[PDB]
Amino acid sequence: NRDMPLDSDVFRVPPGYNAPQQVHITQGDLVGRAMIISWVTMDEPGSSAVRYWSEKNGRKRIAKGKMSTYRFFNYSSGFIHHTTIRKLKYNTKYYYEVGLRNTTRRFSFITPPQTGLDVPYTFGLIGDLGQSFDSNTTLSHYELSPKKGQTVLFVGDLSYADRYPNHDNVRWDTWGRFTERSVAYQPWIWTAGNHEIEFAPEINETEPFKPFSYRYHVPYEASQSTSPFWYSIKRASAHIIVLSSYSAYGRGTPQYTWLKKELRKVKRSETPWLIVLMHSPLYNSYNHHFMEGEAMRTKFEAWFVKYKVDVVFAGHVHAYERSERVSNIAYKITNGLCTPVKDQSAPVYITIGDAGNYGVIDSNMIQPQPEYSAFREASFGHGMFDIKNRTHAHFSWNRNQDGVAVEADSVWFFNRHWYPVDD
Amino acid sequence: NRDMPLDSDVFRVPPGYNAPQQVHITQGDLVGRAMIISWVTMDEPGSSAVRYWSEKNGRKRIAKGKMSTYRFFNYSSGFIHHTTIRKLKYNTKYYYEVGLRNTTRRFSFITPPQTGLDVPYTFGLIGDLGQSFDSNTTLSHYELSPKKGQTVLFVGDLSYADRYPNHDNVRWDTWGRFTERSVAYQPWIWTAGNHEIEFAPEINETEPFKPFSYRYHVPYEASQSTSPFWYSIKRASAHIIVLSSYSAYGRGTPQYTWLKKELRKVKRSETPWLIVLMHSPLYNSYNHHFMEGEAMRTKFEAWFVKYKVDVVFAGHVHAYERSERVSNIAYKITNGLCTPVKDQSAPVYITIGDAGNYGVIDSNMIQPQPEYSAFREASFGHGMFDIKNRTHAHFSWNRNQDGVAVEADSVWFFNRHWYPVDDS
């Protein structure tokens, strides 16, 4: 129902014996000189080797990775490959090949420039993609964007395989072949959503995030995190912090402890743009999932303001919303201070979980529009966070019903460290 | 430093080659017909077999368990045994013996009566015990109490070994040896507190709850939980729900999912008393750890009110507090309703984390006392929750500076399901 049929063109299997499929890449290190290359072979294990080279140096090298598999209920996965290429040059085009033993497929990516204060960079924002027809339109809109996204920040809810009978994991495979046309060529930065949890005791699957964690690796050790579900990376002029809404974040827990130290590490004269990703929005004025973000908000909101986070992106709610710069950190149980106030040190909260999911939009909103909410609309679409320099970043929202160059909402971000004026 | 020295009498090693030590028991099933028997052997692995018998029939039986070990930094544990005895008769004294291969030690426990509407039962309440001199006094007060506790509900922070260099796990062994004089003869129900987390990446110990989880087992499968850190048991007329303050409880997480379903399973017609244990208090008017409980509260408070939880016990704060029946569940971000109100459908929240810790009391209080707080005092002590029948339970708090029979605070609970009268 609204999910694309198994025989859709986007799900076609790359031909050839043991042809690599579901190819995807993401940042492999802390600063952008590494890339994790990932893929599945279905006919037999095959090699985890990856051949790569720049189009200038031309010198072909080999990286060696690891193979793994998993079962989920009555599903058995193919052979999953993860391999890290390291010590790449900044701002250069590389070609890479996988499937060296049997049927090779070749791709390419462009390393970002070295991190720096005034380095421009364009990030795409996609949330709650799924694999419905709406999902395919959003991806087409992103790739056809005139702005040209160089990396996608993904706020969680990838395949929605768990909506299927016994979570039919084939629908991970299909989502993988589906998204390849983008993530094979540019990194997507993964955030874990509730559809990735796949906690299902009724069929004896009780390991949280299993399918997701096997298929999508992240460079978590690089930020001294002890878990794939929270970690940070730097790219161009942005310091990106990925949190787990569905992991522990109580005082003294690994994620809470890791976040607190990580914030101390941020250097705004190197990475001016402080960006946080999480699945569940801390600010949300839709009926659906209203106030789910309250728990995390009590732990982390004050930290976000103290460190002057520029922007917090979330999905989970199937619609679009952009908050005012507000905070709600003055409450003391009995002092009655529980209303959000204008606060120029606070980030803007953006809900961008409207990429298509299984074809349903969340349109019931709390009335009236709260003062903390600047703009909200129930349409499928995606975002673009375009960094011009240390003071200015341009955010735009593009709807699926619009032309690919139309921005139904846009706003200039004025950097909280370098240029904290009213935006 | 107020920790009891290594050579204290409470820490003495039971004599004999490979004599079992740190012997402790806890309920091993959902309804009280099983008991998990736990102990450590130091000289060699030994047998994990437990010999046991009832007084009534006096037939000797053997149950087989499992041995385990762990390492934490440069510490290697001894040999830890967990063995579950099953199909026990209700309301009956049992004897059990461990160390069958070399040095045998014998103990006993009394199974609770079958769950029922009006089955009376007396629960001890103990939190943040530690191994200081104060800790020893609280344990003495508990065992000497004329109310005679039959099971301890333990709200977390056990040994505080993690305050020691590299968490010196020898301090878990001493704690085990010291608490034996109680826990070997009656079950303590374990809650995980922040001192059990032991997250220490700096010395490559990145697995939360490790020492704790190896040393203290719970019957978590019996309530269909997938983790030792949240679970349920039924005992006499009580349904006890144990939660993990330092595990995930976001919507869709194992814990959140488990609690939600478990509340629906509660049968107040079988167990009238609905009790929740957690480490970090959802209501707390002390400076220390003020508002740390807020996150779990936003997630679970409305559920507690909806399911008419009688009482929620917590520790963490090193003192005593008893709230009024109150809720703070009407907040909607912009409607200004963030003040706790009297709510007779709500549970009473009790902080009882004052058993001694490492000798420090939390004395600093927000002033004046909030309307949500009925009673508080920064003194060392323990609680007793004494169930009389389906409608009446008597709670009382005893101070370490008073006589063992003196109640500094005490209140009648009227059951939220069977007798919903203003018990203020």
Ligand SMILES: *[C@@H]1O[C@H](CO)[C@@H](O[C@@H]2O[C@H](CO)[C@@H](O)[C@H](O)[C@H]2NC(C)=O)[C@H](O[C@@H]2O[C@@H](C)[C@@H](O)[C@@H](O)[C@@H]2O)[C@H]1NC(C)=O
């Ligand atoms: C950072 O990037 C900004 C966005 O492109 C720059 O502002 C743009 O500057 C153009 C000429 O500099 C001007 O025609 C555009 O209208 C303007 N765009 C906006 C949204 O203002 C900005 O250049 C600076 O800041 C503005 C406010 C002016 O003072 C310019 O004269 C400045 O150069 C860039 N700032 C830096 C530090 O490079």
Ligand SMILES: *[C@@H]1O[C@H](CO)[C@@H](O[C@@H]2O[C@H](CO)[C@@H](O)[C@H](O)[C@H]2NC(C)=O)[C@H](O[C@@H]2O[C@@H](C)[C@@H](O)[C@@H](O)[C@@H]2O)[C@H]1NC(C)=O
């Ligand atoms: C585990 O490591 C500890 C050091 O990281 C050991 O304790 C230290 O031993 C030093 C001499 O080796 C001594 O000067 C230090 O004061 C002491 N450090 C601390 C913080 O305690 C420890 O060793 C044992 O206990 C100490 C106190 C001495 O009695 C040693 O002889 C013991 O080996 C180590 N424990 C183990 C099991 O290795």
Ligand SMILES: *[C@@H]1O[C@H](CO)[C@@H](O[C@@H]2O[C@H](CO)[C@@H](O)[C@H](O)[C@H]2NC(C)=O)[C@H](O[C@@H]2O[C@@H](C)[C@@H](O)[C@@H](O)[C@@H]2O)[C@H]1NC(C)=O
């Ligand atoms: C621990 O208990 C074991 C029996 O459960 C002892 O092994 C037994 O010792 C008996 C001497 O009384 C001997 O006849 C048995 O053959 C033996 N059973 C075995 C080996 O399975 C054990 O004894 C010590 O170890 C044995 C091997 C001999 O060296 C004895 O002389 C030792 O005392 C007991 N361990 C100790 C240290 O008491």
Ligand SMILES: *[C@@H]1O[C@H](CO)[C@@H](O[C@@H]2O[C@H](CO)[C@@H](O)[C@H](O)[C@H]2NC(C)=O)[C@H](O[C@@H]2O[C@@H](C)[C@@H](O)[C@@H](O)[C@@H]2O)[C@H]1NC(C)=O
């Ligand atoms: C449930 O337990 C309650 C506390 O033990 C019982 O109340 C007590 O009843 C005594 C006579 O049985 C009386 O002298 C005590 O003062 C009283 N205790 C308290 C704290 O009220 C209760 O008994 C019922 O209710 C009380 C108020 C009287 O009406 C008695 O006649 C009743 O027995 C117990 N409920 C039942 C059904 O036994």
Ligand SMILES: *[C@@H]1O[C@H](CO)[C@@H](O)[C@H](O[C@@H]2O[C@@H](C)[C@@H](O)[C@@H](O)[C@@H]2O)[C@H]1NC(C)=O
């Ligand atoms: C995949 O590549 C490997 C290594 O180059 C080849 O050995 C495989 O060849 C196939 O299997 C070998 C043993 C031989 O029998 C050959 O005739 C087969 O074609 C190759 N796999 C396939 C199926 O092409």
Ligand SMILES: Cc1ccc(-c2nc(C(=O)O)cs2)cc1
């Ligand atoms: C800032 C601060 C200081 C002490 C503490 C402690 N808590 C405990 C506890 O018993 O939970 C022991 S020390 C926590 C936070």
Ligand SMILES: *[C@@H]1O[C@H](CO)[C@@H](O)[C@H](O)[C@H]1NC(C)=O
């Ligand atoms: C998805 O969109 C692509 C690109 O716009 C198009 O080529 C393809 O036919 C579409 N497939 C489906 C099933 O919608």
Ligand SMILES: *[C@@H]1O[C@H](CO)[C@@H](O)[C@H](O)[C@H]1NC(C)=O
């Ligand atoms: C798994 O189970 C379902 C029925 O529950 C069945 O229809 C499906 O074909 C099975 N798949 C495999 C791989 O056995």
Ligand SMILES: *[C@@H]1O[C@H](CO)[C@@H](O)[C@H](O)[C@H]1NC(C)=O
């Ligand atoms: C602890 O308490 C017991 C019983 O009161 C007493 O016999 C023992 O000596 C005490 N030990 C210490 C070290 O306080």
Ligand SMILES: [Fe+3]
């Ligand atoms: Fe979603």
Ligand SMILES: [Fe+3]
């Ligand atoms: Fe404590």
Ligand SMILES: [Zn+2]
């Ligand atoms: Zn979601």
Ligand SMILES: [Zn+2]
């Ligand atoms: Zn504590």
